[PDB]
């Protein structure tokens, strides 16, 4: 066996403890991935750090499932019911915001997103996140940093990020 195992890329050492990753099927020194031999006994399926990292990054790129869509609706609704969401519920009315459409080239609001969710417009979570981010970026671009509108965007985006944790 001339294969270089683990993240450290070294030949197999029969005297050292290794744990196998069920995702990539490579073998890792327990110490290099933070797993103790006694600890391995209590582990069922094992996924190494690099594979876990890839899976985490993958979440926003994979196809949205019907279960994912039920989740998107849940997230949207929690945002719509949030106290700081009132400025983003519907498209901005020109009469309420001077030259808004002359400043904002790509408007977005929660009602438009709800419609997109309804017609399954999003194919990846990254697209949903992009529209939501657009709402907050548009607000912070149009409104001054000391206006409550700007602050509502800061609050809601922080709330949104937490809401998305462990989504898929």
């Amino acid at each position: 066996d001339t294969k270089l195992y683990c993240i450290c890329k070294t030949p197999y050492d029969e005297s050292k403890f290794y744990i196998g990753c069920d995702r990539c099927q490579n073998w890792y020194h327990g110490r290099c991935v933070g797993i103790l031999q006694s600890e391995a006994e209590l582990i069922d399926e094992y996924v190494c750090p690099q594979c876990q990292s890839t899976e985490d990054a993958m979440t926003v790129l994979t196809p949205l499932t019907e279960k994912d869509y039920e989740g998107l609706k849940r997230v949207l609704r929690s945002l719509q019911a949030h106290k700081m969401a009132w400025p983003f519920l519907e498209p901005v009315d020109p009469n309420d915001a001077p030259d808004y459409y002359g400043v904002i080239k790509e408007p977005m609001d929660l009602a438009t997103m709800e419609e997109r969710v309804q017609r399954r417009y999003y194919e990846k979570l990254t697209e949903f996140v992009a529209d939501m981010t657009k709402i907050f970026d548009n607000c912070r671009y149009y409104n001054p940093s000391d206006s409550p509108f700007y602050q509502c965007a800061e609050v809601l985006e922080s709330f949104f990020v937490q809401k998305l944790k462990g989504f898929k």
Binding site: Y12, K16, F17, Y18, G20, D44, E45, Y46
Partner: peptide
């Protein structure tokens, strides 16, 4: 979990 021991 699958492992290799000394």
């Amino acid at each position: 979990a699958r492992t290799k021991q000394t």
